Amino acid sequence: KTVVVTTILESPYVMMKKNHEMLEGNERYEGYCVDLAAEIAKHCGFKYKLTIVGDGKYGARDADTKIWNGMVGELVYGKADIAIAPLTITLVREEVIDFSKPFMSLGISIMIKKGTPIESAEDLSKQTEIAYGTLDSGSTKEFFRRSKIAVFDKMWTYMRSAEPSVFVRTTAEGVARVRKSKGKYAYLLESTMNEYIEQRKPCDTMKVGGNLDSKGYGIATPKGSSLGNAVNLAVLKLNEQGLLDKLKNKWWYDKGEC
Amino acid sequence: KTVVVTTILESPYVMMKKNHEMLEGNERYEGYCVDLAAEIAKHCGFKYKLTIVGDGKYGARDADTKIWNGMVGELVYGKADIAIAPLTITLVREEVIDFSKPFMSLGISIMIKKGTPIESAEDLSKQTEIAYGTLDSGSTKEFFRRSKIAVFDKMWTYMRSAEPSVFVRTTAEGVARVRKSKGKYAYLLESTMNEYIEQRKPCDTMKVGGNLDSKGYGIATPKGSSLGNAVNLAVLKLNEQGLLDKLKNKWWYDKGEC
Numbered sequence: 001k002t003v004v005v006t007t008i009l010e011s012p013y014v015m016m017k018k019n020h021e022m023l024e025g026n027e028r029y030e031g032y033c034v035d036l037a038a039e040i041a042k043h044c045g046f047k048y049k050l051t052i053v054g055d056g057k058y059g060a061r062d063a064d065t066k067i068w069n070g071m072v073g074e075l076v077y078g079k080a081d082i083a084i085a086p087l088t089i090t091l092v093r094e095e096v097i098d099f100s101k102p103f104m105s106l107g108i109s110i111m112i113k114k115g116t117p118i119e120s121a122e123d124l125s126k127q128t129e130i131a132y133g134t135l136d137s138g139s140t141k142e143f144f145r146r147s148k149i150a151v152f153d154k155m156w157t158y159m160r161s162a163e164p165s166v167f168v169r170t171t172a173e174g175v176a177r178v179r180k181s182k183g184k185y186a187y188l189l190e191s192t193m194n195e196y197i198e199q200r201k202p203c204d205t206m207k208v209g210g211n212l213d214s215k216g217y218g219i220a221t222p223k224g225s226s227l228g229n230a231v232n233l234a235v236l237k238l239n240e241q242g243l244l245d246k247l248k249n250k251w252w253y254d255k256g257e258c
Numbered sequence: 259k260t261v262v263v264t265t266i267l268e269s270p271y272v273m274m275k276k277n278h279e280m281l282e283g284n285e286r287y288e289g290y291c292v293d294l295a296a297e298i299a300k301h302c303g304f305k306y307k308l309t310i311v312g313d314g315k316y317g318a319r320d321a322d323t324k325i326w327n328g329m330v331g332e333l334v335y336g337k338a339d340i341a342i343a344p345l346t347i348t349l350v351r352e353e354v355i356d357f358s359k360p361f362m363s364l365g366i367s368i369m370i371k372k373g374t375p376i377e378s379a380e381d382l383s384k385q386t387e388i389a390y391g392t393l394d395s396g397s398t399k400e401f402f403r404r405s406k407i408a409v410f411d412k413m414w415t416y417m418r419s420a421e422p423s424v425f426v427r428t429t430a431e432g433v434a435r436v437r438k439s440k441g442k443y444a445y446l447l448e449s450t451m452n453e454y455i456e457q458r459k460p461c462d463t464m465k466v467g468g469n470l471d472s473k474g475y476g477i478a479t480p481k482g483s484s485l486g487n488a489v490n491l492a493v494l495k496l497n498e499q500g501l502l503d504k505l506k507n508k509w510w511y512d513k514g515e516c
């Protein structure tokens with residue numbers, strides 16, 4: 001009867017509280033998705049347990065084995081009842097799991113060190129003095145790898161061939177690289193995270209230009225799950241009440257350092 | 259086998275071509291949703307017929323009879339197979355029909371005549387010199403009627419009690435009222451339409467301030483419809499290809515007069 005929620009550590013969606021080892025259960029964690037899970041459970045009247053996805057992935061199908069990894073996999077194979085995380089609704093994932101309507105919108109976007117003479121994706125695409133890259137795996141890299149749009153295809157060809165490697169292993173490494181490269185590195189990541197980092201010390205990064213795509217994060221459940229229909233209605237209610245808007249203001253701008 | 263599509267005449271989503279009476283069938287119409295329907299049918303491989311919703315409504319349940327009107331009603335009662343229109347995904351509609359993930363995002367927003375000293379919803383709420391209103395029926399009026407948010411509740415109390423009536427029967431009447439009122443009337447409508455009108459002659463209106471809410475338009479089908487699953491995957495594909503973005507650019511800014 002206790003709902004098994006899979007999620008992932010990713011600021012400010014889910015983080016461990018600084019004093020977590022003194023605490024127990026769901027109270028160990030805080031963040032946008034922590035609050036969102038509590039609001040959903042409250043409205044739906046169920047008990048739940050926050051668990052962290054074992055492989056630290058969002059969800060992709062291995063070409064060789066055809067096995068789904070990440071939170072998507074935990075749902076497909078019945079290891080969890082629901083995923084609450086900044087998990088993008090995509091065509092390939094929609095075919096294997098159910099998604100709520102989006103609880104938050106986003107797009108791929110450009111992060112620069114303040115002063116970097118870049119304003120758009122097209123700008124980056126037409127030069128090489130300012131190196132630019134993204135995560136060495138995951139959805140943004142796949143977006144570029146697969147894009148048939150001229151500018152993005154040019155950007156991909158550059159990134160894959162650029163030396164030294166313009167890719168990084170983690171978002172922290174990416175942001176650290178922006179900050180240390182003296183304007184000579186720009187970073188591609190989701191607008192939500194870009195905006196969050198813009199409001200934190202040392203206040204030396206900025207989101208520039210329009211988003212490169214448009215998509216949403218959804219709550220995910222195994223295909224045909226009865227819990228899925230209910231949680232989707234809950235997300236629609238919370239949105240219509242303005243609670244989702246308050247939640248973003250809480251975690252993005254209220255706790256704003258810049 | 260021919261899919262019955264219900265839709266509604268609403269610029270620039272669906273309009274009759276200036277020479278329509280010389281034409282036949284789907285070719286009579288043009289617009290964002292006309293192109294979107296063609297792109298969906300092409301990908302899904304079905305034939306379809308565009309029909310216009312008989313009562314000219316989007317979809318609401320009559321409190322007395324409990325009967326659904328508009329496009330939602332045509333789906334609920336089996337008069338149409340699918341609705342393709344700027345139809346908002348809402349909690350009450352989601353309970354009675356299926357919706358794709360959103361094909362376009364929007365929010366309620368403020369339209370002013372250029373020069374009108376208003377920048378936000380809060381601005382309007384704290385004064386009465388500049389009258390403000392909305393459609394005399396439909397979703398925006400219902401949004402204000404039902405809102406528990408302080409500023410919007412204040413705005414509703416003002417609108418319902420303001421004399422002369424700040425409400426209008428049609429969007430054209432609303433926009434005409436903005437243009438003729440010499441800065442003494444402001445209008446509340448969906449951001450999509452606000453942005454469209456901003457780019458058309460006489461270029462004397464402007465969208466100001468952030469949106470008041472956040473929501474999406476979805477393709478709708480009867481609950482449990484097998485066509486529904488397929489079209490949803492199609493919408494996700496078109497989005498991921500950038501085709502939805504091209505479609506908005508086509509109808510909003512490419513044909514831009516301002």
Ligand SMILES: N[C@@H](Cc1cc(Cl)c(Cl)c(-c2cncc(O)c2)c1)C(=O)O
Binds near residue numbers: 086089174188192194
């Ligand atoms: N939405 C993604 C997972 C994800 C979440 C978040 Cl919050 C961020 Cl910020 C990113 C990211 C994307 N590009 C560069 C980066 O450093 C991080 C990726 C999915 O569903 O696969």
Ligand SMILES: N[C@@H](Cc1cc(Cl)c(Cl)c(-c2cncc(O)c2)c1)C(=O)O
Binds near residue numbers: 316347451
């Ligand atoms: N999305 C709505 C229908 C609808 C569509 C559009 Cl494109 C516009 Cl612009 C409006 C509108 C809202 N407020 C003032 C106005 O003049 C028009 C309403 C629904 O699903 O009920």
